[PDB]
Structure 1
């Protein structure tokens, strides 16, 4: 994956920061956003974000996933 790709939540992902159901559990599975960033480094030195794929969805809402929780589309 990489920035610009479009993806769909193919694995159970329960966030709580969704404006739709703010402060309350909500499964993101099924939604199609777009990878906005992939966190592996920072100034050449390695980072260790356990959810390095940042996806930006519909309604200025974005969330973090692992590579397997998402599948590229096309």
Structure 2
């Protein structure tokens, strides 16, 4: 639980995506490139109601992206530790 306690500390921290990565679940945005975008970690989804889950993308990260003609859309995407860097 020493990698889980290390990971739990990062909840709420600001991150930036360091690798090219496209996601398709943002509502009414068919495709989003996440390389360079900034958000913060909202959860470490490996831990769930006292139990442990075998999620390969354990960090649920909140992003807001500006869409022309419509306004900021808020969404979540799960990331691996090697796909983002912490900010300051």
TM superposition score category, shorter chain reference = 0.7 to 0.9
Provide structure 2 residue ranges, at least 5 long, that are not aligned to the other structure.
1-6, 65-72
Structure 1 counterpart of 2:58: 52
Structure 2 counterpart of 1:12: 20
Q: SS at 1:64's partner residue?
A: strand
Larger mean CA deviation between 8-17 and 41-50 belongs to: 41-50
Greater per-residue helix proportion: 2
Q: Distance in 1 between matches of 2:48 and 2:41?
A: 18
Structure 1 outlier segments of 4+, above 4 Å: none
The root-mean-square deviation of aligned C-alpha atoms, in Å, is 1.7
TM-score (norm 1): 0.82
* Structure exhibiting the larger radius of gyration computed from Cα positions: 2
Matched, 1:72 2:86: yes
